[PDB]
Write a protein that binds this ligand. Structure first.
Ligand SMILES: Nc1nc2c(ncn2[C@@H]2O[C@H](COP(=O)(O)OP(=O)(O)NP(=O)(O)O)[C@@H](O)[C@H]2O)c(=O)[nH]1
Ligand SMILES: Nc1nc2c(ncn2[C@@H]2O[C@H](COP(=O)(O)OP(=O)(O)NP(=O)(O)O)[C@@H](O)[C@H]2O)c(=O)[nH]1
Ligand SMILES: [Mg+2]
Length: 179
């Protein structure tokens, strides 16, 4: 209360430890980055309110370490989420290859009809690129996922990545005028 919003969307970040989930969260919600961030303790969330078609959408973004955890924690994490972002590190091909493992956790825990986006983070490390863009783009298309390469470090495409997901959920859950 105190805040006028039309929608609240819970969105979860999933992906290997180290890919940059927490920095994506912090960059998107509070415009902060930390080069010395460590593995996440417990579960955290932050919120940013954006505007789409003149409606205010509260985007509540959840974060937890990309590591094995108990069933009760993972169920609470996914519960109520209407969007997910699967994150890999464009400089680390093993993280990208593990995306199918994250897709599996998603299918196993997520509510019906969640919007899914794939993010290749750390695009500022293109001098050490291990994952070709066209390969990742194709993988996203094959699995009906949004796709963006981002850098939490320099802010490149971070708003774009989150906004596109939010706009996609918004599209789904509201009525729209034609012409
Ligand atoms: N809780 C609450 N907040 C309101 C209400 N009306 C306006 N506000 C706050 O006042 C802010 C400024 O109003 P408004 O200009 O309508 O915001 P917008 O965000 O719609 N800006 P433009 O529309 O861009 O100014 C709103 O963004 C909102 O945070 C209200 O009825 N209840
Ligand atoms: N160069 C660069 N480094 C990044 C970028 N994003 C995150 N990092 C760095 O990569 C490291 C890991 O980031 P972090 O956000 O903590 O990853 P995480 O996915 O949250 N890990 P965990 O799951 O364990 O909690 C940190 O040193 C962080 O600063 C980026 O866009 N570019
Ligand atoms: Mg983290």
């Amino acid at each position: 209360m105190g805040y006028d919003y039309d929608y609240l969307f819970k969105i979860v970040l999933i992906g290997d430890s180290g890919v940059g989930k927490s920095n994506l969260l912090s960059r998107f919600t509070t415009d902060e980055f930390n080069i010395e961030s460590k593995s996440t303790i417990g579960v955290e969330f932050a919120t940013r309110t954006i505007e789409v078609e003149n409606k205010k959408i509260k985007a509540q973004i959840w974060d937890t370490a990309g590591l094995e955890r108990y069933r009760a924690i993972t169920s609470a994490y996914y519960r109520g989420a209407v969007g997910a972002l699967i994150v890999y590190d464009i400089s680390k091909s093993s993280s990208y290859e593990n995306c199918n493992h994250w897709l599996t956790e998603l299918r196993e825990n997520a509510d019906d009809n969640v919007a899914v986006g794939l993010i290749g983070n750390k695009s500022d490390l293109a001098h050490l690129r291990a994952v070709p863009t066209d390969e990742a783009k194709n993988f996203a298309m094959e699995n009906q996922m949004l796709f963006t390469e981002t850098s939490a470090l320099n802010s490149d495409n971070v708003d774009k990545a989150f906004r596109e997901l939010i706009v996609a959920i918004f599209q789904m859950v509201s009525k729209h005028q034609v012409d």
